[PDB]
Amino acid sequence: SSERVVINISGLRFETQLKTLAQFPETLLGDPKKRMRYFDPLRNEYFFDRNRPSFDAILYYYQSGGRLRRPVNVPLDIFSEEIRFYELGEEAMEMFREDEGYPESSGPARIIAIVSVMVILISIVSFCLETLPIFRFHTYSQTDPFFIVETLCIIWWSFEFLVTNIMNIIDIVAIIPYYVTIFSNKSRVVQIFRIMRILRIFKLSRHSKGLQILGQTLKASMRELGLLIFFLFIGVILFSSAVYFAEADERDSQFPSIPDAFWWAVVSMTTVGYGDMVPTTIGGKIVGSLCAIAGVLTIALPVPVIVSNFNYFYHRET
Amino acid sequence: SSERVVINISGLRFETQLKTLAQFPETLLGDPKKRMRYFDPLRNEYFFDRNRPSFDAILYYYQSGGRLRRPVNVPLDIFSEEIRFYELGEEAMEMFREDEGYPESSGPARIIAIVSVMVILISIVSFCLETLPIFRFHTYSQTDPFFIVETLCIIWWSFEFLVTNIMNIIDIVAIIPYYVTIFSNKSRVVQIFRIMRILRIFKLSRHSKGLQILGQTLKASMRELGLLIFFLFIGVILFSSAVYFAEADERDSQFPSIPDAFWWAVVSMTTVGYGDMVPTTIGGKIVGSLCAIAGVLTIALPVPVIVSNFNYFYHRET
Ligand SMILES: [K+]
Ligand SMILES: [K+]
Ligand SMILES: [K+]
Ligand SMILES: [K+]
Ligand SMILES: [K+]
């Protein structure tokens, strides 16, 4: 049907073919029975007392064949109410949303969170006091406070551990390495498990939104971190080699070899500047100069992206 | 012909002179035979059931005389389909594109890339283990593993080297310095060629998109890098001189002369802070204070640009 249709939005006139609207017979504009109500027989046009900027986009949805892009100058909340009213359907709404991006249950079951906080914000506190010198076969490996108030929560964890998903694995591993070494040689293994007790700090994400935000900010940037590292690796292997063949001939060269310079390379590029290794010759100091400059440029490339990814996610869930 | 023409885009009315459209007789709107089909004789106007925001620009193309600028609020993909439909010609499309900016051949000829990866991601690994102290006339210069698995790929390279362009020179130089010293004095030249073996790392760009991206990000910033360096050079020569005439009178002055201070200057401005050279007097510490501050400002000027250049290129080829 060529029969043209005129739609007047608060004074703004839009025209189109009736078949263009026929493409989505389930919508408001596509169903005779539904739009019938907005028809003005004195002017042969359908009239809606609604948002103007929004409609331009709605019409293109039918014209293009399904492209539902919100107009830059149209708020996200207003543009949605329109997609709603004009009834573009669910499958269309989602496709729109996509392209557009229990503690606190009541108070009682909520404060049950605080009893999980300290059980961490102190489980950490203890894990560190162990390494203290003022607190350090059955002794070479290994009752004792740093084993008392510890299990005082070790089973406290395994409790809610039954009361899958990432957020959950944060409690499994938060107790795994423990019963692992408990298991034999009555008289460096199991070492990989005491150092894995630290992960327990991640249990905080269950109450730290800012933290969990960073979580996705990462996976949603895997390709960025990679580039960052790849570049570094490049600048490093590259600069470590130059500084070497520039100091090679030295009765002082602080670079036994290239693999050694690596440490220097990283520390320089990241602008830390420890000093536990520096060029003494001129060639090396020239090489080093660039290494400092290139360091900035290098890092300052993939980073900005990752910066935005957080910029978003942070306010999105806000 | 003054004869005015009325064009109605989905309800939006545009008017113009017929001669304005005559300027491009090869286009749709400029050819009678072509637009004839969209004419509405009851209203004396040509009607198109298409994108509204786009047309404003199309008309100006004829009005201005050839300026085809996409509207800020119009997606790049939509605006192109329009340039297409309205048939503005090829020479116009390119001029538009400009202002707007075999491994994986099938799988088999694709994995032929992995056999090039290790032949690098290990050619590097070896080039570094040479400098190792635990591995070091016919000996003063110079069979040996660091010559075994090396050529084990040296000719492996010269193979595809025949199986011009920048990306290619990455393999030429990736074997040049080798046969160069092979060539005489049976009993510091050729030194400039062992240090040129490192460039071999660049052979990675043939499989590192992120890397090659950085490639253009650079040439497309030559004017930036320059400014960066020029400024530094300025701040350096400038600050090295101040810190000197401020320490000159010292039984400790760590600055033999101005050319010496250079090292300090660079290290300070780039915020590395080695420590292998610092001001001891007050004048010097004042001078140094500014040197640190000015360092930030200096670098933080040309950089942002270069940042954007990558910001773009990165997502462009994405
Ligand atoms: K710094
Ligand atoms: K910094
Ligand atoms: K520093
Ligand atoms: K430092
Ligand atoms: K230092």
- Write the DSSP assignment of B241-306 as a string of letters: HHHHTTTSS-SS-S-SSHHHHHHHHHHHHTT----SS---SHHHHHHHHHHHHHHHHHHTTHHHHH
- Spatial separation of the C-alpha atoms in residues A72 and B177, rounded to whole Å: 56
CA atoms within 13 A on the CB side of B56: 9
Beta strands B12-17 and B39-40, pairing class: unpaired
Beta strands B4-9 and B39-40, pairing class: unpaired
- Spatial separation of the C-alpha atoms in residues A129 and A123, rounded to whole Å: 10
The distance between the two most distant Cα atoms of chain B, rounded to a whole number of Å, is 100
CB contact burial A10-27 (16+ within 10 A = b; e otherwise): eeeebbbbeebbeebeeb
Alpha helix (H) residue ranges in B100-219: 114-121, 123-130, 145-160, 166-172, 176-182, 209-219
Fold (CATH) for A102-207:
Four Helix Bundle (Hemerythrin (Met), subunit A) (1.20.120)
Q: Could you tell me the CATH superfamily of domain B1-101?
A: Potassium Channel Kv1.1; Chain A (3.30.710.10)
- Spatial separation of the C-alpha atoms in residues A15 and B68, rounded to whole Å: 26
Q: Residues B52, B10: contact at Cβ < 8 Å?
A: yes
- Spatial separation of the C-alpha atoms in residues B228 and B221, rounded to whole Å: 11
Give the DSSP letter of residue A62. Answer: I
Contacts of B43 in chain A (CB under 8 A): none
Q: Residues A264, A240: contact at Cβ < 8 Å?
A: yes
Closest residue on chain B to A256 (Cα): B133
Q: Which amino acid is at A90?
A: E
Contact A238 B198 (CB under 8 A): yes
Q: Residues A83, A54: contact at Cβ < 8 Å?
A: no
CATH 3.30.710.10 domain residues, chain A:
1-101
**A211 CA to centre of ligand 4 in angstroms:** 30
Beta strands A45-48 and A12-17, pairing class: unpaired
* Torsion angles phi and psi, residue B77, rounded to 5: -75, -35
User: Is residue B6 within a helix (H) or strand (E), and if so which, with residue range?
Assistant: strand B4-9
Q: CA dist B178 to A67, A152, B122, B146, B173, Å? A: 58, 66, 17, 13, 9
- Spatial separation of the C-alpha atoms in residues B273 and A117, rounded to whole Å: 39
CATH 1.10.287.70 domain residues, chain B:
208-318
Which technique was the structure solved with, according to the deposited record? X-ray
Pick the CATH number of A208-318 from 1.10.287.70, 1.10.10.10, 3.40.640.10, 3.40.50.970: 1.10.287.70
Contact B191 A278 (CB under 8 A): no
Question: Pseudo-torsion of CA A181, A184, A188, A190, nearest 10°?
Answer: -10
Q: Of A258, A293, A300, which has the smallest distance from its Cβ to B128's Cβ?
A: A258
Q: Which ligand sits nearest to residue B272's alpha carbon?
A: 3
User: Is B157 strand, coil or helix?
Assistant: helix
Closest residue on chain A to B75 (Cα): A69
CA B161 to chain centre: 26
CA atoms within 13 A on the CB side of B144: 9
CATH 1.20.120.350 domain residues, chain B:
102-207
- ∠A67-A69-A75 over CA atoms, to 5°? 155
Q: Residues B71, B79: contact at Cβ < 8 Å?
A: yes
Q: Which amino acid is at A311?
A: N
Give the DSSP letter of residue B178. Answer: H
Task: For chain B, give the number of residues.
Answer: 318
Query: Who contacts A260 (Cβ-Cβ below 8 Å, separation ≥6)?
Result: A240
User: B225, B210, B226, B227: which is closest to B310 by C-alpha?
Assistant: B210
**B87 CA to centre of ligand 5 in angstroms:** 65
Contacts of B133 in chain A (CB under 8 A): 256-257
Query: Who contacts A246 (Cβ-Cβ below 8 Å, separation ≥6)?
Result: A279, A281, A283, A284, A286, A287
- Spatial separation of the C-alpha atoms in residues A270 and B112, rounded to whole Å: 36
- Spatial separation of the C-alpha atoms in residues B129 and B125, rounded to whole Å: 7
- Spatial separation of the C-alpha atoms in residues A146 and A135, rounded to whole Å: 9
Query: Who contacts B138 (Cβ-Cβ below 8 Å, separation ≥6)?
Result: none
Q: Which residue has the tokens 């290129």?
A: B313
- Spatial separation of the C-alpha atoms in residues A294 and A83, rounded to whole Å: 50
- Segment 222-261 of chain A within 8 Å of chain B by CB: 223, 226-227, 230-231, 234, 237-238, 240-242, 244-245, 256-259
